[PDB]
Amino acid sequence: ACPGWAEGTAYKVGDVVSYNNANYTALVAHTAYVGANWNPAASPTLWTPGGSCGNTVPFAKHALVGYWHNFANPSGSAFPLSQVSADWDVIVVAFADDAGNGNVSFTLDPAAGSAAQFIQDIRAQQAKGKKVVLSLGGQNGSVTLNNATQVQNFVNSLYGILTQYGFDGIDLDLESGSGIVVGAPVVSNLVSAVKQLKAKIGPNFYLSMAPEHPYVQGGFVAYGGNWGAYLPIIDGLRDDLSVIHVQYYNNGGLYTPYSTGVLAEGSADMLVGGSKMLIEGFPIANGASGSFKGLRPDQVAFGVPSGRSSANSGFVTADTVAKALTCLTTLQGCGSVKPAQAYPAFRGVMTWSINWDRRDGYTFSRPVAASLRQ
């Protein structure tokens, strides 16, 4: 085994230590001075991970979905797609860039290697049964779909990207900058755009959505502005939706019909409750008598932060995730929120992110994949 990382210790370049039961290799000869907290999970300038001493598109029945940073951030730089651990079932490349008007582009972070190597890495991951999809979102995640011309640019440019790189499909993580509100033209145009894109690609087209819960389950309690604004998008694309994994973080608690009070952020109940609403369906505070029709369990997963650096609120332990999963799948280990019937085909778990999980020593992916794996 590798020696545990410890403050007061002098390290040389190439030294391998154990931290959070994972390995890190020293990038710089240095001492971890006491009180500085220069630990491997917090210090990518000092440590790099590694070293030693229906019918929908077919993908993992119980899947671990994660986002792969096509950029550098406090988690560290991007890393080659080939090195994404086997615990991940769907690798979501984050992100594509808005190019306007309607146009989308993609440019690889050079730290991931050459475009040619990246394309080979995609094939190699697919050869192992993984899906590799392109996410719309992030810093340039403001898509304009206000007229038919922009829709066509959207469809054509994304078709070019997918066919060139061999992505299995797309992920929608774009709602915060794209003005997705009730009554906005983008709501109708996005559904039309995705349908047209898939028609060009074929039935292998993978489609996922990662909206924040006010845009979805929020509709139960309020319908206007962003609240409930994603529901007709889901409804319009339900035949094409591979999986929706709502982000149950950064937006406080969740009001469901399964408890007299809101379900607490970071609780298994909230994860179970949010998932129940998507599967059973729920009334919409329409003003009319509108309702959201439930999805198949295989179309539903829940999204959580991979760790403390991944979000501002809504953090969960691996144990909490495991509890929510077994509750949903086998009606066992439930809290105060219980499914009406078991969902043996519940799709699973999404996390931001693969990179943060890697930086933190696979503390999310390892136990959660094990839970999904039974």
Ligand X SMILES: CC(=O)N[C@@H]1[C@@H](O)[C@H](O)[C@@H](CO)O[C@H]1O
SS3 state at 340: coil
Total residue count of the chain as it appears in this document: 374
Partner that binds at residue 15, options ligand X, Ca ion, none, CB closer than 5 to 8 Å by kind? none
CB of 170 to Ca ion, least distance (A): 13
Binding pattern to ligand X, positions 11-40, x when CB under 6 A?
A: ------------x-----------------
From 7, 175, 212, 280, the catalytic residue: 175
Interface with Ca ion, residue 324, by CB under 5 A: no
CB of 133 to Ca ion, least distance (A): 14
Partner that binds at residue 115, options Ca ion, ligand X, none, CB closer than 5 to 8 Å by kind? none
**175 in catalytic set:** yes
Query: Contacts by 52-58 with C-beta closer than 8 Å and gap 24+?
Result: 52/2, 52/16, 52/23, 53/1, 53/2, 53/3, 53/16, 54/296, 54/298, 56/241, 56/242, 56/298, 56/299, 57/131, 57/168, 57/169, 57/203, 57/204, 57/205, 57/206, 57/242
Interface with Ca ion, residue 173, by CB under 5 A: yes
Among 13, 34, 53, 72, binds ligand X (CB under 6 A): 53
CB of 50 to ligand X, least distance (A): 8
Q: How far apart are CA 220 and CA 296, in angstroms?
A: 19
Among 12, 35, 52, 107, binds ligand X (CB under 6 A): 52
Q: How far apart are CA 287 and CA 222, in angstroms?
A: 10
The footprint of ligand X on this chain (CB under 6 A) covers a number of residues equal to 5
SS3 state at 215: helix
Q: How far apart are CA 229 and CA 222, in angstroms?
A: 10
Residues that bind ligand X (CB under 6 A): 1-2, 23, 52-53
Q: Which residues define the annotated binding site for Mg(2+)?
A: 308, 311
Instruction: Indicate which residues carry an active-site annotation.
Output: 175
Q: Which residues define the annotated binding site?
A: 173, 175, 210, 308, 311
Q: Which residues define the annotated binding site for Ca(2+)?
A: 173, 175, 210
